[PDB]
């Protein structure tokens, strides 16, 4: 890798600088370099990794949705034939998105997940694994689509099982995992009832555990709780 000659601490420092500069591709490349040093990641370092790639793939997903919408309209009745360009360019963005998802899934598989033994790291990485298979599922159409969906489901489910055994209901990683697995159910798995049930049960169990927290932990948990409520309001 092109980051192989840079010190681990320097890669982490530069990832923070790139974040400040809103240079998320750079941020992600620095954090991939850091992962490839082979040492486990601290809590703060895991957060830099996830923020970097979430922003990169988030932009690709937004662009893919714009292009897919144009493509769909061009395939409606009465639409003037415009040639292959819309499909070609949607395919170009899709392939680049798939490449980023494969890169992240590769980092998790070599070797972040296998060395992650504490709940806060293992659940975090398995949530990421579910997230990036979910992004692959959003664009999947061929023979492999059901297997991609089940890979997302499997990763989310292992993360869910660990989080319920090992973390309090208000833990922000547990909450964000449930938020996203609920969206997986609604948007990917065609299971809106499961999505609603999960979001409601998660919210209610967190409500009942807020009394144990400091003010700073309370702020963190209620932030994601409001996203659960927002989704429930969208869905009901």
């Amino acid at each position: 890798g092109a980051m192989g000659s840079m010190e681990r601490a320097s890669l982490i420092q530069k990832a923070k600088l790139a974040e400040q500069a809103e240079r998320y591709e750079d941020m992600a490349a620095f954090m991939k370099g850091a992962v490839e040093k082979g040492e486990e990641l601290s809590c703060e370092e895991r957060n830099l990794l996830s923020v970097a790639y979430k922003n990169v793939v988030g932009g690709q997903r937004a662009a893919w949705r714009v292009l897919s919408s144009i493509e769909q309209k061009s395939n409606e009745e009465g639409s003037e034939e415009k040639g292959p360009e819309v499909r070609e360019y949607r395919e170009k963005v899709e392939t680049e998105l798939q490449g980023v998802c494969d890169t992240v899934l590769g980092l998790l598989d070599s070797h972040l997940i296998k060395e992650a033994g504490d709940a806060e790291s293992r659940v975090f990485y398995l949530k990421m694994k579910g997230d990036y298979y979910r992004y692959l599922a959003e664009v999947a159409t061929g023979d492999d689509k059901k297997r991609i969906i089940d890979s997302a489901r499997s990763a989310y489910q292992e993360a869910m099982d660990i989080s319920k055994k090992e973390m309090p209901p208000t833990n922000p990683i547990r909450l964000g995992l449930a938020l996203n697995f609920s969206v997986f159910h609604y948007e990917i798995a065609n299971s809106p009832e499961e999505a609603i049930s999960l979001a409601k049960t998660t919210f209610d169990e967190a409500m009942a555990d807020l009394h144990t927290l400091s003010e700073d932990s309370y702020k963190d948990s209620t932030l994601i709780m409001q996203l659960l409520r927002d989704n429930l309001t969208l869905w009901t």
Partner: peptide, 5 residues
Amino acid sequence: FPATV
């Protein structure tokens, strides 16, 4: 679209 983190 719904919220994810």
